[PDB]
Structure 1
Amino acid sequence: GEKITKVYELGNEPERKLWVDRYLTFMEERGSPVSSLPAVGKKPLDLFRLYVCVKEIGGLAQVNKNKKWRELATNLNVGTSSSAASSLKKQYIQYLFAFECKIERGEEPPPEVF
């Protein structure tokens, strides 16, 4: 139950502020605004760190192929269990994958027309 503004405060990496500004605006404009920090169990998720760590591996598809969700959950202190790994993957898909597509591959969700 932490306010999303806490994500600006979880660290002061030079690139964090711009990333968060871009991310929250991206989410508000697509109709899925984020108001609270997502969590896995009782752990608030530092979305910026999670995004950066997944990017290091090469994105969602690469983490899936290399089966690195348990390593990520362990290294981010989310948990060492298979369930913590699956919960972390779920939160990445729900909160960050659409953004990954936009930022890493210039993907621009085809205008909702069809």
Structure 2
Amino acid sequence: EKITKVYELGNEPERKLWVDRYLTFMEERGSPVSSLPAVGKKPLDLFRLYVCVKEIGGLAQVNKNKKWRELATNLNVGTSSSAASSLKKQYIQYLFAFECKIERGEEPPP
């Protein structure tokens, strides 16, 4: 489905703003997101994924703590190691540049 779908994957107050802030960043770097990402067949909630990876401490920390399977489970995109590997790939492709830019202070945090 369309990326707009990510607005209804949750009820959080800050979802809409984070999403538009995120989509604006992707457009800015030349990689606009038009379709809602997915892990296999299941829809991927990029907002919740971003927030929880941030809770854990970022990509390197999720790797170190081997939390990809737990996150995939929490996001309902599979419980297998295959689902976990795919989720890590999607995080890298859709969110790591954003994590990196924000951490470096170039992009103010959402």
Structure 2 CA distance for aligned equivalents of residues 60 and 79 of structure 1: 19
Residues 69-101 of structure 1: CA distance to partner in whole angstroms, max 9, x if unpaired?
111112222111110000000000000000111
**Residues 27 and 71 of structure 1: is their aligned pair in 2 closer, same or farther, counting only changes over 3 Å?**
same
Structure 1 CA distance for aligned equivalents of residues 106 and 83 of structure 2: 29
Q: Any gaps of 5 or more consecutive residues in structure 1?
A: none
Task: With the length of structure 1 as denominator, give the TM-score of the two structures.
Answer: 0.88
C-alpha displacement at 1:108, in angstroms? 6.4
Structure 2 CA distance for aligned equivalents of residues 23 and 5 of structure 1: 12
Q: Any gaps of 5 or more consecutive residues in structure 2?
A: none
SS at match of 1:96: helix
C-alpha displacement at 1:51, in angstroms? 0.5
Structure 1 or 2, whichever has the larger Rg, is 1
Task: With the length of structure 2 as denominator, give the TM-score of the two structures.
Answer: 0.91
Aligned length: 110
Structure 2 CA distance for aligned equivalents of residues 9 and 21 of structure 1: 13
Same amino acid, percent of matched pairs: 100
**Residues 96 and 81 of structure 1: is their aligned pair in 2 closer, same or farther, counting only changes over 3 Å?**
same
Structure 1 CA distance for aligned equivalents of residues 106 and 85 of structure 2: 26
Q: Which consecutive segments of 4 or more residues in structure 1 shift more than 2 A?
A: 107-111
8 Å contact from structure 2 (residues 102, 109) kept in 1: no
C-alpha displacement at 1:107, in angstroms? 4.3
Greater relative CO, 1 or 2 (CA 8 Å, sep 6+): 2
Residues 44-91 of structure 1: CA distance to partner in whole angstroms, max 9, x if unpaired?
101001111111111101001111111111222211111000000000
